[PDB]
Design a protein around this ligand. Structure first.
Ligand SMILES: *[C@@H]1O[C@H](CO)[C@@H](O[C@@H]2O[C@H](CO)[C@@H](O)[C@H](O)[C@H]2NC(C)=O)[C@H](O)[C@H]1NC(C)=O
Ligand SMILES: *[C@@H]1O[C@H](CO)[C@@H](O[C@@H]2O[C@H](CO)[C@@H](O)[C@H](O)[C@H]2NC(C)=O)[C@H](O)[C@H]1NC(C)=O
Ligand SMILES: *[C@@H]1O[C@H](CO)[C@@H](O[C@@H]2O[C@H](CO)[C@@H](O)[C@H](O)[C@H]2NC(C)=O)[C@H](O)[C@H]1NC(C)=O
Ligand SMILES: *[C@@H]1O[C@H](CO)[C@@H](O[C@@H]2O[C@H](CO)[C@@H](O)[C@H](O)[C@H]2NC(C)=O)[C@H](O)[C@H]1NC(C)=O
Ligand SMILES: *[C@@H]1O[C@H](CO)[C@@H](O[C@@H]2O[C@H](CO)[C@@H](O)[C@H](O)[C@H]2NC(C)=O)[C@H](O)[C@H]1NC(C)=O
Ligand SMILES: *[C@@H]1O[C@H](CO)[C@@H](O)[C@H](O)[C@H]1NC(C)=O
Ligand SMILES: *[C@@H]1O[C@H](CO)[C@@H](O)[C@H](O)[C@H]1NC(C)=O
Ligand SMILES: *[C@@H]1O[C@H](CO)[C@@H](O)[C@H](O)[C@H]1NC(C)=O
Ligand SMILES: *[C@@H]1O[C@H](CO)[C@@H](O)[C@H](O)[C@H]1NC(C)=O
Ligand SMILES: *[C@@H]1O[C@H](CO)[C@@H](O)[C@H](O)[C@H]1NC(C)=O
Lengths: 226, 312, 161
């Protein structure tokens, strides 16, 4: 069942990526931002900034050096401020991209190379494993996570009383289908008979709030009887 | 801090406020102002993304049942209070009360009532369902037994909780009361949020005050230059003012971009804390308060989030 | 008064709406300034009345549109204005024209601001509504009820960085 579910999930990833393009908006945003910045940088070459012509060669071929100096100074001021703007925006954007790259390196180290217990760091669910996939100027992680599916109401109890001794579950939780009490692992319903091998005894019955009564089946007594 | 104030500024009205000659002179500079507006709009969109990342982490809007048998733990000061008009908690109300030319301030996409609804959903999920509602469908669990699970997550067996439940509940209620009293007494707590607010206010005020500077021109008033000088020389003076005011905008936008990068780092940290600290239980040391982390409760705040880290 | 005029008092000039203000100038004071050195009140030289100056209303004009591949019908958002200064909807985010107000709440598609979103839903036209935070739920919490999942789903999610 688990292998089939995983194969189906990979198939659904294929279907989504071959269907909708909106998934890679994060990479496309980077590409578009950089392209728009370069387009603005180029279009700033065609501005006058107050000079008689945006083209340097026209000013040079039209004016004597004393006035060509003033016009070229105007153009130089404008274009140098354009590069200053472009470089500042690029530095800020590259800091943001480096933050994303550090996050992706952390996700690869803690998410592909191991199993993360951090919540929502590796996809929504209980992280199982992650598979990296390269992408143009980026990385795509396929986070395989465990998601509980079909939950059933149960009656629960913090502990149970057997002989004046309060039994708490070792690794699990006491539940009751309505008549019989069981101990089950808390993430997946598999009922088990409450024995001394499933529980541990601490203190007496007068303290725990919500304690209930049941028999803790001692395995050794039937063996002694037989 | 999670978000800034979504401020947008129009060049043509800022540099050349209602002036034909100045606007014509400003045309020569190209797309400087288109890219200024683009940078500011990108910042504002990022601010909405910050708030959505931090708070909109819960699929369904859970709500605590009218019966409040939380094993003796008293969450009345953090759960929503319907008596107030806006469905905010007592501590959220304290937090909100403690914080005090082409320039537009765009309203945030999520209103404060919606932010409070998200924090309410997160509290209800954490209280009534532990960490399960982050992994999947919210599964109810008695709060005493959830605290037993959290104790087991720090290396203390659950019998300790069950045998010291009354003392633990009293200690937790005492701690919540101490939070209330501190947040009613001293305003020095919310310096992190008030600093963001003050920095933005100083930036905008300086940007406006820059309209009173000559930048070398005969006057900082543009109509006065127009009514005093002949067009050939008024062009030079207006170009001086345009260069000065355009530089003022460029400085303001660059500074806002850097500050917004800082705020986005803070908002990513807040999103990580909400995911790993409210929706779960963290074994990362000192990431969720000084101690062994048991559970955390979020509270909305003016342009920020407040985490109440319960630690052992 | 109460009209966008290009005034010119004693020496100071500007554009705005002049309204009967209740500020109390001193007898020698002529005009008032804001915290940011911006003139907001002027004493009328002929009759000693104090007039508050408010800038003539302005703001961005934002066009809300689904994809042209989907439709060529749009809506317009006049930011932070009275709807009279412009199927008309007044919001906190401005004046919205061309979108039909709906009392239903849906998942946000095109963000407008202050909790209002827009979308192109059905016979199809632009709708504007208070965005929905999610499907409101109440957990069946009680002091002895636990829910334990009896089955699981292995999900593969894509994260792009
Ligand atoms: C709770 O579980 C117990 C144990 O499985 C159920 O008791 C068994 O029920 C089946 C059929 O219902 C019988 O064939 C067994 O003989 C029963 N065993 C014992 C020891 O009684 C019990 O019926 C379940 N209760 C509910 C309400 O479903
Ligand atoms: C679990 O079993 C114990 C023992 O039978 C119950 O304790 C009895 O409680 C009643 C009333 O509180 C007393 O009159 C008896 O004297 C107690 N027993 C003894 C041996 O002293 C206890 O009440 C049971 N709990 C539940 C929930 O049924
Ligand atoms: C949870 O704590 C709050 C605050 O201490 C309690 O509310 C107070 O209750 C007392 C007694 O009824 C009143 O005199 C106060 O006026 C209340 N204060 C406020 C701010 O409402 C509340 O009773 C506690 N809940 C439980 C179940 O003990
Ligand atoms: C300027 O002259 C006008 C009229 O020539 C004055 O207006 C009069 O002002 C007085 C006192 O304020 C009022 O009693 C009259 O009703 C006004 N007359 C009219 C026709 O409105 C005005 O006061 C003068 N102002 C100055 C500063 O000399
Ligand atoms: C757990 O859920 C899975 C998935 O719904 C169930 O497997 C399905 O079983 C039906 C009936 O045999 C098949 O038609 C489907 O093809 C199965 N799904 C898959 C993905 O193989 C499974 O039966 C459930 N387990 C329990 C105990 O309820
Ligand atoms: C558990 O019981 C409550 C109340 O009877 C109900 O609201 C809830 O749907 C039940 N859970 C399931 C999984 O049916
Ligand atoms: C749960 O609350 C009900 C309602 O009063 C009460 O009868 C019952 O004893 C409580 N049980 C526990 C374990 O708190
Ligand atoms: C419009 O969108 C559809 C997908 O719904 C796509 O198949 C189609 O090519 C698009 N039209 C154009 C002109 O791109
Ligand atoms: C905007 O103008 C209209 C018409 O005068 C008015 O009804 C409305 O109240 C104004 N806006 C606000 C926020 O009051
Ligand atoms: C939406 O609610 C308002 C407020 O009561 C009401 O006047 C209006 O008729 C409602 N619209 C519809 C379509 O029901």
């Amino acid at each position: 069942l688990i292998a089939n579910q995983f194969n189906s999930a990979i198939g659904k990833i294929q279907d989504s990526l071959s269907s909708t393009a909106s998934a890679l908006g994060k990479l496309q945003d980077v590409v578009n931002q950089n392209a728009q910045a370069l387009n603005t940088l180029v279009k700033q070459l065609s501005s006058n900034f107050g000079a008689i012509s945006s083209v340097l060669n026209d000013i040079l071929s039209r004016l004597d050096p004393p006035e060509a100096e003033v016009q070229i100074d105007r153009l130089i001021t404008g274009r140098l401020q354009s590069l200053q703007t472009y470089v500042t925006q690029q530095l800020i954007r590259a800091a943001e991209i480096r933050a994303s790259a550090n996050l992706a390196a952390t996700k690869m180290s803690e998410c592909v190379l191991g199993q993360s217990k951090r919540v929502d760091f590796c996809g929504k669910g209980y992280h199982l494993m992650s598979f990296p996939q390269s992408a143009p100027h980026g990385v795509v992680f396929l986070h395989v996570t465990y998601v509980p599916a079909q939950e059933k109401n149960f009656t629960t109890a913090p502990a149970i009383c057997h002989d004046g001794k309060a039994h708490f579950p070792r690794e699990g939780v006491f539940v009751s289908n309505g008549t019989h009490w069981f101990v089950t692992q808390r993430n997946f319903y598999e009922p088990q008979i409450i024995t001394t091998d499933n529980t541990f005894v601490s203190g007496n019955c007068d303290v725990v709030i919500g304690i209930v009564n049941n028999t803790v089946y001692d395995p050794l007594q039937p063996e002694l009887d037989s | 801090p999670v978000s800034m104030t979504k401020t947008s500024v129009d060049c043509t009205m800022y540099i050349c406020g209602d002036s034909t000659e100045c606007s014509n002179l400003l045309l020569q500079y190209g797309s400087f102002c288109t890219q200024l507006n683009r940078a500011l709009t990108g910042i504002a969109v990022e601010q909405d993304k910050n708030t959505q990342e931090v708070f909109a982490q819960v699929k369904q809007i859970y709500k605590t049942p009218p019966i409040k048998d939380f094993g003796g733990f008293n969450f009345s000061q953090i759960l929503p209070d319907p008596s107030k008009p806006s469905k905010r908690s007592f501590i959220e109300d304290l937090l909100f009360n403690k914080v005090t030319n082409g320039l537009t301030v765009l309203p945030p996409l999520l209103t404060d009532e919606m932010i409070a609804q998200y924090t309410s959903a997160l509290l209800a999920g954490t209280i009534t369902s532990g960490w399960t509602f982050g992994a999947g469908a919210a599964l109810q669990i008695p709060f005493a037994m959830q605290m037993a699970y959290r104790f087991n997550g720090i290396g203390v067996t659950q019998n300790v909780l069950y045998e010291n439940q009354k003392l633990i509940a009293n200690q937790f209620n005492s701690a919540i009361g101490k939070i209330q009293d501190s947040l009613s007494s001293t305003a020095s707590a919310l310096g992190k949020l008030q600093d963001v607010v003050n920095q933005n206010a100083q930036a905008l005020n300086t940007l406006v005050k820059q309209l009173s500077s000559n930048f070398g021109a005969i006057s900082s008033v543009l109509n006065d230059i127009l009514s005093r000088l002949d067009p050939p020389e008024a062009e030079v003076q207006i170009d001086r003012l345009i260069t000065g005011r355009l530089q003022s905008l460029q400085t303001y936008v660059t500074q806002q971009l850097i500050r917004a990068a800082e705020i986005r780092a803070s908002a990513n940290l807040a999103a990580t804390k909400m995911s790993e600290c409210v929706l779960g239980q963290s074994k990362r040391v000192d990431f969720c308060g000084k101690g062994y982390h048991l559970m955390s409760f979020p509270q909305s705040a003016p342009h920020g989030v407040v985490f109440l880290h319960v630690t052992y | 008064k109460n009209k966008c005029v290009n005034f010119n008092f004693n020496g100071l000039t500007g554009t705005g709406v002049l309204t009967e203000s209740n500020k109390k100038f001193l007898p020698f004071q002529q005009f008032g300034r804001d915290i940011a050195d911006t003139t907001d009140a002027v004493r009328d030289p002929q009759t000693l009345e104090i007039l508050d100056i408010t800038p003539c209303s302005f703001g961005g004009v934002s066009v809300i549109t689904p994809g042209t591949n989907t439709s060529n019908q749009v809506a317009v958002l006049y930011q932070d204005v009275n709807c009279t200064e412009v199927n008309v909807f007044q919001t906190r985010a401005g004046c919205l024209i061309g979108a039909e107000h709906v009392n239903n709440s849906y998942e946000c598609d095109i963000p407008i601001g202050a909790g209002i979103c827009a979308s192109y839903q059905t016979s199809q036209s632009i709708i504007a509504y208070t965005m929905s935070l999610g499907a409101e739920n109440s957990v069946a919490y009680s002091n002895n009820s636990i829910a334990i999942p009896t089955n699981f789903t292995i999900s593969v999610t894509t994260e792009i960085l």
